[PDB]
């Protein structure tokens, strides 16, 4: 659906990188649901008050993603400036809520795959945005 | 169910990238002024669905009354969308892909409606 | 007519959104936070859902009487229900108290504009 | 210092619903096919400014390399919103409305940011 859209855009993009664009889309949607799905799964463990960080970094990092996934699917009146600020951020963000899930990751099997979300999605950011 | 709550939570997220891809998409056409009514809908089902997608993240079975509402007033607006879009479909293949998108959403939504009860 | 209106209500539900995130966030700092965990969601569905709303009110182009009632309804819904979790903690917690205070007037507000359209 | 973050929310939030508005004008005008750069701007400064209002209101200076990138990409998104809706505020109203309140939200996200 990602491609498809991309592919019907009325217009020249430049020459930004139409895979990697996808792909970075793509994986700040599964990013945001994998951030919102520990975020939840963290307020139902009974030491909750011990995730308190793992959550609010959840929290960012979906919020981020879902704003970066919109910046990046609209190509009228480009202006790199906004975009390569936007995925800069994600790419933060996504790295900082890797670190703090990798740190729950042994004992909840929810921060585990978070992390491993957080880190394809801060990959994916760095790699587009070295390719722009 | 779980299974039909993260099917629900994928497609809205989908469904509000494909809207918000869609609104920019008719936003280049040469045909723009013709087309505003489809990019104010787009850009409300991608609000709803974005909304959707975060309310049935959180639900937990207790005050069902929430993820009904939030389930309803999105079903509602994909419907919308999906009708509008609809009508550019023959002329903009990303009109046809949106409308698509926004049907299987609607329908996710309506199944987890059906569900809860 | 209805344009006053709207735009009190969008106004109420940026106020509301804010209270709720603010809420949601001292909520979390709590000590008792594993007794708060319900107020949290709740706070984070009626910020999301506010959000949605003003924004949707915001834009009148293509209108659609059925889409906004739909939304209306669902942030009403939403607001009622933030109102109802946080006035249980309200006693305890001032953050709840005027949290509780910003929904059932965003309640007000989507309910008198669902009202007047329909 | 907590009242200049709750500050910056407020502005955040009222920021994007002057680029929603402001987009939705433009969609409106007769000259809409002159105002899609002014639109889709407003429309990644209302999601950049909602994404910033939610993360300033989870801040808690642990991990403030988030809270600064997020602000940066927000002062980012709003100078450029300001600059294009700037072009026409001479003729849209609403398009300087939306001007102003992007350099304001500018201007209190550098603030912040600087102060952290
Ligand atoms: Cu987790
Ligand atoms: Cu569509
Ligand atoms: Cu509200
Ligand atoms: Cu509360
Ligand atoms: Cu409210
Ligand atoms: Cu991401
Ligand atoms: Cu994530
Ligand atoms: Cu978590
Ligand atoms: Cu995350
Ligand atoms: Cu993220
Ligand atoms: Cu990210
Ligand atoms: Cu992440
Ligand atoms: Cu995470
Ligand atoms: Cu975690
Ligand atoms: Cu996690
Ligand atoms: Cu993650
Ligand atoms: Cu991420
Ligand atoms: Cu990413
Ligand atoms: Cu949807
Ligand atoms: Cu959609
Ligand atoms: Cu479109
Ligand atoms: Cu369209
Ligand atoms: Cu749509
Ligand atoms: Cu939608
Ligand atoms: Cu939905
Ligand atoms: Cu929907
Ligand atoms: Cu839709
Ligand atoms: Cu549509
Ligand atoms: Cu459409
Ligand atoms: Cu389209
Ligand atoms: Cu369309
Ligand atoms: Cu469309
Ligand atoms: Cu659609
Ligand atoms: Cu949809
Ligand atoms: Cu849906
Ligand atoms: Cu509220
Ligand atoms: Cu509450
Ligand atoms: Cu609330
Ligand atoms: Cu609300
Ligand atoms: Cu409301
Ligand atoms: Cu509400
Ligand atoms: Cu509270
Ligand atoms: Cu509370
Ligand atoms: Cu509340
Ligand atoms: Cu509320
Ligand atoms: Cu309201
Ligand atoms: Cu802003
Ligand atoms: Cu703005
Ligand atoms: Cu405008
Ligand atoms: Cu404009
Ligand atoms: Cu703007
Ligand atoms: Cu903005
Ligand atoms: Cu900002
Ligand atoms: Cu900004
Ligand atoms: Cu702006
Ligand atoms: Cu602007
Ligand atoms: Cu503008
Ligand atoms: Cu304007
Ligand atoms: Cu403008
Ligand atoms: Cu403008
Ligand atoms: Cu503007
Ligand atoms: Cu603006
Ligand atoms: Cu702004
Ligand atoms: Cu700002």
Redesign the interface.
């Known amino acids: 659906?990602?491609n498809?859209?991309?592919r019907?855009?009325?217009?020249d993009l430049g020459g930004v990188d139409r895979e990697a664009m996808a792909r970075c889309?793509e994986e700040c949607?599964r990013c945001?649901?994998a951030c919102?799905?520990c975020?939840?799964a963290c307020?139902?463990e009974?030491t909750?008050?011990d995730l308190?960080?793992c959550?609010?970094?959840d929290?960012?990092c979906?919020?981020?993603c879902?704003?970066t996934?919109?910046?990046l699917?609209?190509?009228?009146?480009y202006?790199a400036?906004?975009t390569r600020?936007?995925l800069?951020?994600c790419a933060?963000?996504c790295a900082?809520c890797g670190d703090?899930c990798a740190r729950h990751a042994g004992m909840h099997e929810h921060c585990r795959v978070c992390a491993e979300a957080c880190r394809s999605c801060e990959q994916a950011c760095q790699e587009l945005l070295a390719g722009l």
């Not at 699917?73 to 009146?77: E, N, Y």
Request: hydrophobic share 50%; aromatic share 2%.
């Open positions: 659906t990602v498809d859209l991309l019907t855009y009325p217009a889309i949607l945001a649901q919102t799905a975020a939840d307020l139902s009974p909750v008050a308190t960080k959550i609010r970094t929290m960012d979906a919020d981020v879902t704003a996934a919109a910046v699917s609209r190509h009228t009146g202006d400036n906004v600020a936007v800069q951020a933060t963000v900082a703090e």
